[PDB]
Design a protein around this ligand. Structure first.
Ligand SMILES: *[C@@H]1O[C@H](CO)[C@@H](O[C@@H]2O[C@H](CO)[C@@H](O)[C@H](O)[C@H]2NC(C)=O)[C@H](O)[C@H]1NC(C)=O
Ligand SMILES: *[C@@H]1O[C@H](CO)[C@@H](O)[C@H](O)[C@H]1NC(C)=O
Ligand SMILES: *[C@@H]1O[C@H](CO)[C@@H](O)[C@H](O)[C@H]1NC(C)=O
Ligand SMILES: *[C@@H]1O[C@H](CO)[C@@H](O)[C@H](O)[C@H]1NC(C)=O
Ligand SMILES: *[C@@H]1O[C@H](CO)[C@@H](O)[C@H](O)[C@H]1NC(C)=O
Ligand SMILES: *[C@@H]1O[C@H](CO)[C@@H](O)[C@H](O)[C@H]1NC(C)=O
Ligand SMILES: *[C@@H]1O[C@H](CO)[C@@H](O)[C@H](O)[C@H]1NC(C)=O
Ligand SMILES: *[C@@H]1O[C@H](CO)[C@@H](O)[C@H](O)[C@H]1NC(C)=O
Lengths: 49, 216, 81, 226, 48
């Protein structure tokens, strides 16, 4: 299935011979590049300074 | 004619980035293959609806450069070159009057509004210059007063009426189109059917989205 | 497919694998938003704008009429479930 | 000529049906949709629906009824949902097929059993006849239609002015090839000399715009002189 | 889709021809019909 879109089409239709047309084989999803965490300034800052 | 050509996939809607939900949905079988197939059939059905309705004409026709139609005004229904999109003033106001990312994607219509307007303009040009003949084979040019006299002959009123009253019927048709213009522009409930269809589809999608906020 | 292979962009989406063609052809595989793809000549898939039809300018006039001199008794097969 | 055209048209229908696999596209799509629905319904028997196994006999031989009933209930709910979905799809598809069947009945009624004046209802063109042909789980119509082919451009006028009184065509179109004005039926070029038989007088000349001076033949004077 | 079949029939019988079906194309003896593209639909100006 994963070799090329044609084989993905064959796996989707479950037929080795696929007729000419357009077939929604899968969905394109962009993965998150990284993770960002944001939190406010530390209000109760311990007076270590 | 064509509802919103939508398509919805389970794997994103029911389950987000989570994979455990996808695995548990997998054990349910091919419900979602059925749903995607049904919605794809609906979308292809919408495209087929648009083609069956508008594409009765095989060869796109162009209106003559000079509008010497014996008195009739079609400037309201013919495309307006001034606007960037070649839509008629009536079509323009019709578009003006009519007024979600969780796997719910709106597939664009195969025929864009510009090409649908092109089909409509071809049908209008065929009706104006040829009449009924363009739908039954070759397009055969015929003066508009003549084909309107033939429409009278079709409804059992002899050709006497039109040729004797060409100017009067021209003015009556023109004022009728102008009154369509005014009643469409002023009254907002004129496009009730299309507004109801769009509202029904939008509220169905909105309900589907809000279902993600239900505990069940 | 890997990116950069004849990438072409339309309103329907980013069409990869078929080179855009300025010429208009009849729709074979409807991409969407007015783009249609066909397998044409050595051989590659071409994505093009729809050709709604041959633009026929009907020679309208206030005294122009066309009357056919011949017909074609064409049997049209309509299949209905 | 018309018999030969009709026969050649039927032969071309035969050849096109034989050559093109997708000629019976509508019927094959209906059969494929029904088969896909049935195959999906059958396959749902293989889906667990959250139960331990998708075959009732195994769980019935594996689990005693007290705790077996929860798994059987999972399978019952899943298979009942699948069957309800299948039955609803079949009901909607059968509504579509019933619309198609009422359409086929109407097409038979005023195309096979009559001649339909509804344009493009039975074949692209001025419909002449329709021959039903039984096909697997459907019907096929051979809409014999009259499609004009070779058009000739002519000069036309809304009327004809003779002796100051407008003459309109009783049935047809006023056309001319240049210096000779002829009245012709709308859908076939058969020029005929202008006569009071196919022209009815209507009003005065000046009322209509586009009228052209001409002569209209009247048959009585050749008999009057003789 | 029933409405779209109705609209296709309406163009076929009124834009592409003249329909004698009473009250099919506008209240009155139908003369013509001008399609007008509208968002997700069509609008007919049934000249009657
Ligand atoms: C009208 O069209 C028909 C066919 O559409 C013409 O018939 C052809 O005539 C030529 C020469 O006369 C033959 O070689 C062909 O075999 C004919 N075709 C068929 C299907 O019979 C016809 O000549 C055209 N003109 C007139 C006046 O009928
Ligand atoms: C050093 O003193 C300053 C006072 O201005 C204080 O802000 C800072 O936190 C002190 N440094 C450390 C390491 O505590
Ligand atoms: C017909 O269309 C408008 C509508 O009244 C009219 O004002 C205009 O003069 C006419 N068009 C032409 C080309 O005469
Ligand atoms: C199509 O026309 C544009 C016009 O600028 C041009 O840039 C492009 O190369 C053309 N494409 C082809 C395939 O000819
Ligand atoms: C169509 O009519 C025009 C009139 O201007 C004429 O010049 C032309 O030759 C006609 N077409 C054919 C194929 O005869
Ligand atoms: C037009 O038709 C008349 C009818 O007899 C014929 O005599 C003439 O040759 C035709 N052609 C022209 C150019 O008049
Ligand atoms: C037809 O229109 C032309 C200009 O377009 C005009 O000169 C001529 O008088 C008109 N004739 C008729 C019969 O309408
Ligand atoms: C027909 O002949 C009369 C005779 O005076 C003339 O006034 C009129 O203009 C002619 N009609 C045309 C269309 O030339």
């Amino acid at each position: 299935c994963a070799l090329d879109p044609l084989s993905e089409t064959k796996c989707t239709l479950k037929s080795f011979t696929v007729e000419k047309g357009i077939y929604q084989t899968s969905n394109f999803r962009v993965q998150p590049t990284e993770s960002i965490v944001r939190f406010p300034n530390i209000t109760n800052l311990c007076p270590f300074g | 004619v064509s509802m919103t050509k939508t398509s919805v996939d389970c794997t994103m809607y029911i389950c987000g980035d989570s994979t455990e939900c996808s695995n548990l949905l997998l054990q349910y079988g091919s419900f979602c293959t059925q749903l995607n197939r049904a919605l794809t059939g609906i979308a292809v059905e919408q495209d087929k609806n648009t083609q069956e309705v508008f594409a009765q004409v095989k060869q796109i026709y162009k209106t003559p450069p000079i509008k010497d139609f014996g008195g009739f005004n079609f400037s309201q229904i013919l495309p307006d070159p001034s606007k960037p999109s070649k839509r008629s003033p009536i079509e323009d106001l019709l578009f003006n009057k009519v007024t979600k990312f969780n796997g719910l994607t709106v597939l664009p219509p195969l025929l864009t509004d510009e090409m649908i307007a092109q089909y409509t303009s071809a049908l209008l040009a065929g009706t104006i210059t040829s009449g009924w003949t363009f739908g039954a084979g070759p397009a055969l040019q015929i003066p508009f007063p003549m084909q309107m006299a033939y429409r009278f002959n079709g409804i059992g009123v002899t050709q006497n009426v039109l040729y004797e009253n060409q100017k009067l019927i021209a003015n009556q048709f023109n004022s009728a189109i102008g009154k369509i213009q005014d009643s469409l522009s002023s009254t907002p409930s004129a496009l009730g059917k299309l507004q109801d269809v769009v509202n029904q589809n939008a509220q169905a999608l909105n309900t589907l989205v809000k279902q993600l906020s239900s505990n069940f | 497919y890997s990116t950069g292979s004849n990438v072409f962009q339309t309103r329907a989406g980013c069409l990869i694998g078929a080179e855009h063609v300025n010429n208009s052809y009849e729709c074979d595989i409807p991409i969407g938003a007015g783009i249609c793809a066909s397998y044409q000549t050595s051989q590659s898939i071409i994505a093009y704008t729809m050709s709604l039809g041959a633009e026929n300018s009907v020679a309208y006039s206030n005294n122009s009429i066309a009357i056919p001199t011949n017909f074609t008794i064409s049997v049209t097969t309509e299949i209905l479930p | 000529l018309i018999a030969n055209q009709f026969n050649s048209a039927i032969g071309k229908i035969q050849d096109s049906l034989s050559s093109t696999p997708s000629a019976l596209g509508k019927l094959q799509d209906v059969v494929n949709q029904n088969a896909q629905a049935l195959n999906t319904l059958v396959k749902q028997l293989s889906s667990n629906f959250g139960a331990i196994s998708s075959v009732l006999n195994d769980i019935l031989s594996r689990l005693d009824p007290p705790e077996a009933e929860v798994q059987i209930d999972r399978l019952i709910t899943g298979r009942l949902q699948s069957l309800q979905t299948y039955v609803t799809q079949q009901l909607i598809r059968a509504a579509e097929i019933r619309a198609s069947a009422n359409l086929a009945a109407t097409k038979m009624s005023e195309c096979v059993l009559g001649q339909s004046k509804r344009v493009d209802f039975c074949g692209k063109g001025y419909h002449l006849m329709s021959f039903p042909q039984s096909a697997p789980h459907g019907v096929v119509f051979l809409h014999v239609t009259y499609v004009p082919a070779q058009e000739k451009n002519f000069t036309t006028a809304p009327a004809i002015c003779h002796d100051g009184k407008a003459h309109f065509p009783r049935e047809g179109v006023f056309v001319s090839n240049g210096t000779h004005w002829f009245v012709t039926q709308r859908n076939f070029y058969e020029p005929q000399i202008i006569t009071t038989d196919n022209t009815f007088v209507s009003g005065n000349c000046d009322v209509v715009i586009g009228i052209v001076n001409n002569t209209v033949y009247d048959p009585l004077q050749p008999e009057l002189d003789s």
